[PDB]
Write a protein that binds this ligand. Structure first.
Ligand SMILES: CCCCCCCC/C=C\CCCCCCCCCCCCCC(=O)N[C@@H](CO[C@@H]1O[C@H](CO)[C@H](O)[C@H](OS(=O)(=O)O)[C@H]1O)[C@H](O)/C=C/CCCCCCCCCCCCC
Ligand SMILES: *[C@@H]1O[C@H](CO)[C@@H](O)[C@H](O)[C@H]1NC(C)=O
Lengths: 173, 238, 271, 99
């Protein structure tokens, strides 16, 4: 049928900022719809906005779209970057006249940079018994460069905004 | 929500669309890194399933009242069938295509690969007492397959709702093997007026989704049934 | 070439939307339509019932309902097997001609001749390839359906067309006078003008329109397509490209069978 | 592929006389496939309540439609027919001609 491509695997931007996800499609329909969806970590699809080929740039809510209709680009700009807006965003297109299946893109995840910083690394031991050691990194989030059998959990963020971020990167081997 | 099957068996999933339109239902398959694609189209008015291009003649089937209890069954499933399945329908206006609840299907060559998680709680470092006046418990679940786990903290017998962060995706033990088990980590921050209290419980529990009744088992190890596995700790007075 | 034929248009855009249209035509004129909601043969004229009785028409209604539903469902079911690529159109025309009988029936896929029905069997067009042969093998599965089709083409249509023509003799042989007017067209080039003679409202179709200078037909007259209106009448434009100074004494003449020998003559005025 | 572009012809049932009701016809013939969006435009804006004939096809399987609307011409009014099709990169507009 038609082709859809969004190349960015993941992006990053601070709180109270903005970012745009690109979507390049290749279709032969003179009338069509471009839909934007969000995938939560719990594997749930949420409708965000619909974009009409014969319609102006949709700017409903905190989302805006850019129609490079000659260049076949539907760009999605988000505003007032919050913590909940961190998800995997997909763009698809469908037939306006005969609504049917949606040709999705590869998808693009967003990682909101957290909203004072003080790098540190502590150590912790097991509770029920002995013979277990883990290491922790708190705060940080300014030096976001988090990287044998040394398993390291990626940078952390869940209704926990009541307490400070204290980005917890844990490691264990 | 989570289904675990063995190669050569069949799996029947149900989809939860709020009420739908009791019309035409599309089934979508989504895989990590790939683009979700429509697998089949079910027309309830004639009970006709049209499969997508290049889909095996009897791989999928659909039935049931489309209101809430709509079932799709996969047969002769292989390792490539793993992924998250959604059901979707256009609303009356044909303005948006509502997607129903997705179910994650995991397919393994041998059922002896799914195993329950071992969960451990780790007390905060001593240096955190004077440096920050706040402590951080760490929960770690390891040696479980697949990734279908749900972690939660319970303090004084109540599920926590603050100061806890968990990485959404687990970290594989050894990514070389396809059947590799993963591990999950979580952090929970408390103050010095609650952790230093000896009479304060901290129970980190993970709900693990695995086999159930009618699932054949032969290994001498404990049967990896879906179950709640928890670890717990108490705060040191000093 | 007095032919009556039924046309079938099946459009398959995607797996969700499939449209079906059935209609009946006496040559250029449409006389019947199919209603899927009531599954009834809507007659567009009082004489569209032709010569058959109500029982025969009800039998035809039931036959058409069964045939249309089964054919639509079958084309949907055999789409992947027959290598039918979405989106695709299936077009069918079938009927009889003439004094004499002369039946026919054929089907096109994607606008090109695909198969036809010849005596009691579907034959594939050689240029259509193996897909047409597979379609003919599928179409020839049931001998009862082919017998019904042969009876419809060789018996039902020849008996129906005579009665339809007799009942519609007043409407078909009616004479409607044309009207004509003159206008300017786009400039063909520098120092040249385009003169347009419109003739509208005439029936039947044949008509004669020519630019004249006195008795001399202007052979530069360009006669366009005969175009229909919502009523039964027709429209036609005739254009003439002339030098700006050579447009004097030019006129447009229209002959139609309804005018009874009194040709319409319009004279050009360039002021 | 094997797709046929529509032929679009605009005309009037009667000669244009200001203040006198008349009919505007747009004839769209010889196109394939049949999915088409034909609109009649008065001064640019789409004319609502436009009638069209039932779909049909000629001997060579190409489709044709007739769209028509009742209208009263004005001195400064202009009319057109706008067609969209798979063979058209942009909609094709054929204007009505009155001198
Ligand atoms: C607008 C109304 C005008 C009224 C005019 C009144 C005057 C009439 C005068 C002249 C009429 C001229 C036009 C005649 C057109 C005839 C139609 C063409 C032939 C269509 C034949 C369709 C047959 C059909 O229903 N197909 C079905 C029969 O299947 C059977 O299914 C059975 C199980 O249910 C068995 O499997 C069986 O297999 S067997 O091996 O066990 O026998 C098998 O054959 C099958 O599902 C469909 C197969 C493909 C059909 C599609 C291709 C044909 C399309 C052309 C028809 C359109 C015509 C529309 C108007 C009728
Ligand atoms: C009208 O139908 C009758 C009954 O079949 C038939 O005898 C008669 O010839 C028909 N008339 C015409 C003109 O076809």
């Amino acid at each position: 049928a038609q082709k859809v491509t969004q190349a960015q695997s993941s992006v990053s931007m601070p709180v109270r900022k903005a970012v745009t996800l690109n979507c390049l499609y290749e279709t032969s329909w003179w009338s069509y719809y471009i839909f934007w969806y969000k995938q939560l970590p719990s594997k749930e699809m949420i409708f965000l906005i619909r974009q009409g080929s014969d319609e102006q740039n949709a700017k409903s809510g905190r989302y805006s779209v850019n129609f490079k209709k000659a260049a076949k680009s539907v760009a999605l700009t988000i505003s007032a970057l919050q913590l909940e807006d961190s998800a995997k965003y997909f763009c698809a297109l469908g037939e306006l006249r005969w609504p049917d299946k949606l040709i999705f893109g590869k998808g693009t995840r967003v990682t909101v940079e957290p909203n004072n910083p003080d790098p540190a690394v502590y150590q912790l031991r097991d509770s029920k018994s002995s013979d277990k050691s883990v290491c922790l990194f708190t705060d940080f989030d300014s030096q976001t460069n988090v990287s044998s059998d040394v398993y390291i959990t990626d940078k952390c963020v869940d209704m926990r905004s009541m307490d400070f971020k204290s980005n917890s990167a844990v490691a264990w081997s | 929500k989570s289904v675990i099957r063995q190669t050569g068996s069949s799996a029947e999933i149900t989809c939860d669309l709020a009420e739908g339109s009791t019309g035409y239902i599309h089934w979508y398959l989504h895989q990590e890194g790939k683009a979700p694609q429509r697998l089949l189209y079910y027309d309830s008015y004639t009970s006709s399933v049209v499969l997508e291009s290049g889909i095996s003649p009897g791989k999928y089937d659909t039935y049931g009242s489309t209101r809430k209890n709509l079932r799709m069954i996969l047969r002769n499933l292989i390792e490539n069938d793993s992924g998250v399945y959604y059901c979707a329908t256009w609303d009356g206006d044909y303005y948006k295509k509502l997607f129903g609840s997705g179910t994650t299907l995991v397919v393994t060559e041998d059922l002896k690969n799914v195993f329950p998680p071992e969960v451990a709680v780790f007390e905060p470092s001593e240096a955190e007492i004077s440096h920050t006046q706040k402590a951080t418990l760490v929960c770690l679940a390891t040696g479980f397959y697949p990734d279908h786990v749900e972690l939660s903290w319970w303090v004084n017998g109540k599920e926590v709702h603050s100061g806890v962060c968990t990485d959404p995706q687990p970290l594989k033990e050894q990514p070389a093997l396809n059947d590799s088990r993963y591990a999950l980590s979580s952090r929970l921050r408390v103050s010095a007026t609650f952790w230093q209290n000896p009479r304060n419980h901290f129970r980190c529990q993970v709900q693990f989704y695995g086999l159930s009744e009618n699932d054949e088992w032969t290994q001498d190890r404990a049967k990896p049934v879906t179950q709640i596995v928890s670890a717990e700790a108490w705060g040191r007075a000093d | 070439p007095l032919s009556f034929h039924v046309i079938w248009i099946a459009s398959f855009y995607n797996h969700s939307w499939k449209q079906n249209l059935v209609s009946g035509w006496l040559s250029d004129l449409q006389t019947h339509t199919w209603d899927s909601n009531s599954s009834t043969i809507v007659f567009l004229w009082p004489w569209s019932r032709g010569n058959f009785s109500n029982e025969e028409w009800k039998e035809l209604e039931t036959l058409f309902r069964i045939r249309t539903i089964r054919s639509f469902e079958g084309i949907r079911r055999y789409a992947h097997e027959l290598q039918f690529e979405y989106p695709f159109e299936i077009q069918v025309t079938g009927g009889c001609e003439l004094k004499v009988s002369g039946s026919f029936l054929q089907l096109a896929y994607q606008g090109s001749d695909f198969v036809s029905f010849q005596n009691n069997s579907w034959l594939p067009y050689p240029v259509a390839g193996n897909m047409a042969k597979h379609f003919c093998k599928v179409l020839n599965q049931n001998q009862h359906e082919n017998d019904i089709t042969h009876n419809l083409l060789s018996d039902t249509c020849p008996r129906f067309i005579l009665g339809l023509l007799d009942a519609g003799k007043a409407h078909l042989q009616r004479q409607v006078k044309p009207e004509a007017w003159l206008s300017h067209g786009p400039s063909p080039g520098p120092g040249h003008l385009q003169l347009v003679c419109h003739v509208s409202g005439f029936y039947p179709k044949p008509v004669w329109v020519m630019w004249m200078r006195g008795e001399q037909e202007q052979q530069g007259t360009q006669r366009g397509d005969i175009l229909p209106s919502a009523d039964g009448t027709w429209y036609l434009r005739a254009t003439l490209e002339v030098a700006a100074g050579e447009a004097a004494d030019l006129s447009c003449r229209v002959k139609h069978s309804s005018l009874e020998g009194q040709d319409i003559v319009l004279y050009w005025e360039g002021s | 592929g094997i797709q046929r572009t529509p032929k679009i012809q605009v005309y009037s049932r009667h000669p244009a006389e200001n203040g006198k009701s008349n009919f505007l016809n747009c004839y769209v013939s010889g196109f394939h496939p049949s999915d088409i969006e034909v609109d009649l435009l008065k001064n640019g804006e789409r004319i609502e309540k436009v009638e069209h004939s039932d779909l049909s096809f000629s001997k060579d399987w190409s489709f044709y439609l007739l769209y028509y609307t009742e209208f009263t011409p004005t001195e400064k009014d202009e009319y057109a027919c706008r067609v969209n099709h798979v063979t058209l990169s942009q909609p094709k507009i054929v204007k009505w001609d009155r001198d």
